[PDB]
Write a protein that binds this ligand. Structure first.
Ligand SMILES: N[C@H](CCC(=O)O)C(=O)O
Length: 270
């Protein structure tokens, strides 16, 4: 393990980091003031895994803007809805939860049952894709429910994005005008409160950044993290998306790769 870990630590650019883990790494670092992007494989497709949940939540928030009280609607959590990864919803089997609380749960813990219940509320993967298209993202696409959506095959575009498409979408939705201000602020706060990314991009980013993020993974080789970086001292935010497939290293080493993306990105911002 030591040589691979040492090579990951020594990598000072994204191409070298990809080589150090024998993986396929897609990164976009986006300066929201200028639109300038730096990265690696920015326009190749990668499986979203749970990174899509940011946009499922955005779809809910967008629908709530035209459906008064949607966020307060209560949705039953049934035994049949529960999946292996349901850390919040498991305590509510046999009762219900608000749509708003399901959104928070799916963002900050990646709760899979919460996501499937929200898919039922909004009209499924087609409604999330339609939201993405209407927002100006012609690339990202939601196709399946949990847990099937986490599969990937080259040439199979289901449930995929590109680093650059997702970065632009985070800008438009989390920072821009796709949602009303109170909706976008609620979504930003959920991302800021994420609990699953402590070993990923956040571990490589310094204290000058307030970070919101959403992670994803599968059991084969995928580990992802997408983030918005607000400068605590003020100024324009940055967006950092990172998609990795690296089957030759461990799950924990995949986090180390994402942390190194953060370290490289922080130095590139300056
Ligand atoms: N597929 C994982 C969620 C399920 C799990 O962690 O077991 C993710 O992308 O966050």
């Amino acid at each position: 393990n030591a040589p691979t870990d040492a090579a990951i630590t020594a990598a000072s650019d994204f191409a070298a980091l990809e080589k150090a883990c024998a993986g396929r790494l897609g990164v976009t670092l986006l300066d929201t003031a200028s639109g300038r992007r730096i990265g690696h494989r920015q326009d190749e497709r990668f499986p979203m895994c749970s990174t899509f949940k940011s946009m499922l939540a955005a779809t809910v928030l967008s629908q709530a803007e035209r459906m008064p009280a949607l966020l307060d609607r209560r949705v039953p959590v049934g035994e049949a809805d529960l999946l292996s990864h349901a850390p919040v919803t498991r305590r509510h089997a046999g009762k219900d939860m608000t749509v708003r609380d399901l959104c928070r749960a799916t963002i900050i813990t990646s709760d899979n049952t919460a996501a499937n219940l929200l898919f039922g509320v909004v009209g499924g993967p087609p409604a999330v894709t339609a939201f993405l298209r209407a927002s100006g993202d012609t690339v990202s696409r939601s196709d399946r429910l949990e847990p099937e959506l986490n599969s990937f095959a080259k040439g199979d575009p289901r449930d995929t994005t590109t680093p650059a498409a997702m970065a632009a979408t985070l800008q438009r939705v989390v920072l821009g005008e796709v949602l009303q201000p109170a909706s976008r602020q609620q979504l930003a706060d959920w991302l800021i409160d994420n609990e699953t990314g402590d070993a990923c991009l956040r571990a490589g980013l310094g204290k000058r950044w307030r970070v919101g993020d959403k992670t994803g993974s599968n059991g084969e080789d995928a580990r992802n993290d997408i983030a918005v970086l607000w400068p605590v001292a003020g100024g324009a935010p940055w967006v950092l998306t990172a998609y990795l497939q690296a089957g030759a290293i461990s799950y924990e080493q995949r986090a180390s790769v994402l942390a190194q993306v953060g370290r490289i990105a922080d130095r590139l911002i300056g």
